[PDB]
Amino acid sequence: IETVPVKLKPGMDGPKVKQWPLTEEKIKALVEICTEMEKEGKISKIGPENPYNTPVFAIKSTKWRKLVDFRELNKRTQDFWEVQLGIPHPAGLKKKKSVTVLDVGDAYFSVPLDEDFRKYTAFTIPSINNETPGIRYQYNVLPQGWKGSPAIFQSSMTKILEPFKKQNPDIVIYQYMDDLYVGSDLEIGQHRTKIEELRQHLLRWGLTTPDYELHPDKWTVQPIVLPEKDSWTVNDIQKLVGKLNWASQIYPGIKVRQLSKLLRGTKALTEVIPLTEEAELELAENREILKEPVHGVYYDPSKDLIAEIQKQGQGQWTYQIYQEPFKNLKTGKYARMRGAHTNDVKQLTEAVQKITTESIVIWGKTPKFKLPIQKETWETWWTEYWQATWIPEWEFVNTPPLVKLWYQ
């Protein structure tokens, strides 16, 4: 097979990202995987004249998968895979009643990679205690995790999927990186059947697939809810006013002055102030503006998507995806339902992966996360529960939120 030549964006030099140190268990796993892959031609050992590098990790069933972090190499070759070989994003995938996600990364491993490009796929298995230099490979085939791989392979993919698409003209199929998202409006049971058909169909054409049932019907901007309560106190009014004031930054039509007049005299926090009709109308008038959605809230595809996550306690995390402040394109919640089985970093990591999967389905792009975690902590334990082939970009927040209940 001929190799699609890959030029970089001019004036860009290849990735030079230092490799994290790894537990001995994971180094051993990586050495195993790579000895096999070198044996199958998929990668080759390289010398010191190759100065580039790209981190590698080991993640997981009961077997170790290698996971290469091509985040830098992707930005450095963005034209190739977004402009030149772009894969268009189906605006109807988000509207399907069901979306299964199929791992098809194994298709790449047969297709050769351009001989002049391989140098930039270098990676290193590190050593413990710096006892040896490090084992250096570079890829000879399209690598999993690179955004060029799927772009290069979409020709072959469009052909392999043609008979299925003709037979099932209502099923939507989108390819992000190493995964196909297939949506249908079928009964859960029909859907799982149609999916085994596609699995069998892909298998009839030499594509292996191993062995998440998402539902983008309940996927919107969730509405901010005032606490309903039978009785109200000086303090309650005070939390209530504070919540409403902050929302003013989002719906400037929050009319609350009949509440500020409510308790005008310095009163104890426990004083159970009663309800004014003039005040109560400013509360129902405001709960209505809360039911409606925002104005101006549109997806600008020239810009980047931003996700903010807040820990809420008791295993509950809230998130907002936006592009400009206060103009939320989507908000939501996550909850890990296994106590004495789940811990904070597991939750943040599962949260991060659900938000990304959502974002791929709705927009075909990933957000940059604002994570509420210490940088060094996260750089140490994310692989322990990472189950995805892509890696979104991130940065860390050190300023806490003012009122976490402001989002739930």
Partner 1 sequence: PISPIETVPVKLKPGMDGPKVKQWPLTEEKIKALVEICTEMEKEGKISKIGPENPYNTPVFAIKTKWRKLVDFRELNKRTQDFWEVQLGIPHPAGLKKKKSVTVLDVGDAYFSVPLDEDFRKYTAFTIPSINNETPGIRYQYNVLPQGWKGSPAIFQSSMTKILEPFAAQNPDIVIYQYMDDLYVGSDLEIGQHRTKIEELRQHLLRWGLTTPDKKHQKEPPFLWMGYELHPDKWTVQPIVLPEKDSWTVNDIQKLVGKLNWASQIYPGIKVRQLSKLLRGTKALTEVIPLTEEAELELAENREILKEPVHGVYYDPSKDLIAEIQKQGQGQWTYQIYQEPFKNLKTGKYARMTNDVKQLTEAVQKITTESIVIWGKTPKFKLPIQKETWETWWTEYWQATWIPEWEFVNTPPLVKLWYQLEKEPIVGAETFYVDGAANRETKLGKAGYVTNKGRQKVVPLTNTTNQKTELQAIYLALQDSGLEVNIVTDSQYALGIIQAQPDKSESELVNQIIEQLIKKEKVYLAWVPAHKGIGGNEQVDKL
Binds 311: which of partner 1, Mg ion, none (CB < 5-8 Å by kind)? partner 1
**CB atoms closer than 10 angstroms to residue 309:** 22
Judged by CB under 8 A, does residue 200 bind partner 1? no
Among 19, 78, 342, 389, binds Mg ion (CB under 5 A): 19
- Shortest spacing between CB 376 and partner 1, in angstroms: 5
Q: Tell me if 145 sits within 8 A of 390, measured CB to CB.
A: yes
Tell me the number of residues near Mg ion by CB under 5 A: 5
Binds 381: which of Mg ion, partner 1, none (CB < 5-8 Å by kind)? partner 1
Report 215-234 residues binding partner 1 (CB under 8 A).
Answer: 233-234
Tell me the number of residues near partner 1 by CB under 8 A: 61
Residues 6+ apart with CB under 8 A from 186: 97, 98, 194
Among 242, 253, 293, 325, binds partner 1 (CB under 8 A): 242
Nearer to partner 1, 127 or 222 (CB): 127
Tell me the C-alpha distance between 346 and 384, whole Å. 8
Binds 56: which of Mg ion, partner 1, none (CB < 5-8 Å by kind)? Mg ion
Judged by CB under 5 A, does residue 127 bind Mg ion? no
Q: How far is CA 278 from CA 97, 238, 269, in A?
A: 44, 17, 22
Site string for Mg ion, 34-73 (x = CB under 5 A): ---------------------xx-----------------
Binds 136: which of Mg ion, partner 1, none (CB < 5-8 Å by kind)? partner 1
- Shortest spacing between CB 137 and Mg ion, in angstroms: 9
Judged by CB under 8 A, does residue 311 bind partner 1? yes
Q: How far is CA 210 from CA 1, 99, 207, in A?
A: 26, 17, 10
Please report which helix (H) or strand (E) contains residue 369, including its range: strand 368-371
Binds 19: which of Mg ion, partner 1, none (CB < 5-8 Å by kind)? Mg ion
Report 343-402 residues binding partner 1 (CB under 8 A).
Answer: 343-345, 347-348, 372-374, 376-377, 380-381, 400-402
Report 324-343 residues binding partner 1 (CB under 8 A).
Answer: 343
Among 268, 284, 337, 340, binds partner 1 (CB under 8 A): 268
- Shortest spacing between CB 39 and partner 1, in angstroms: 17
- Shortest spacing between CB 111 and partner 1, in angstroms: 27
Q: Name the token pair of 290.
A: 């809360």
Q: Name the token pair of 45.
A: 């050992």
Site string for partner 1, 101-140 (x = CB under 8 A): ---------------------------xxxxxxx-x----
Burial profile 328-356: b = 16 or more Cβ within 10 angstroms, e = fewer: bbbbbebebeeeeeeeebebbbbbbbbbb
Contacts 24+ apart (CB under 8 A), 227-235: 231/272, 232/272, 232/273, 232/274, 232/275, 233/269, 233/270, 233/271, 233/272, 233/273, 234/263, 234/267, 234/268, 234/269, 234/270, 234/271, 234/272, 234/273, 235/269, 235/270
Judged by CB under 8 A, does residue 206 bind partner 1? no
Binding-site positions for Mg(2+) read 103, 178-179
DSSP-H helix ranges across 85-161:
148-160
Please report which helix (H) or strand (E) contains residue 31, including its range: helix 24-39
- Give every strand in the sheet of 368-371, ordered side by side: 328-335, 316-322, 306-311, 368-371, 394-396
Tell me the C-alpha distance between 322 and 300, whole Å. 10
Interface ranges with partner 1 (CB under 8 A): 21-25, 27, 47-51, 53, 128-134, 136, 233-235, 237-239, 241-242, 245, 260-271, 310-311, 313, 343-345, 347-348, 372-374, 376-377, 380-381, 400-404
Binding site for Mg ion (CB under 5 A): 19, 55-56, 123-124
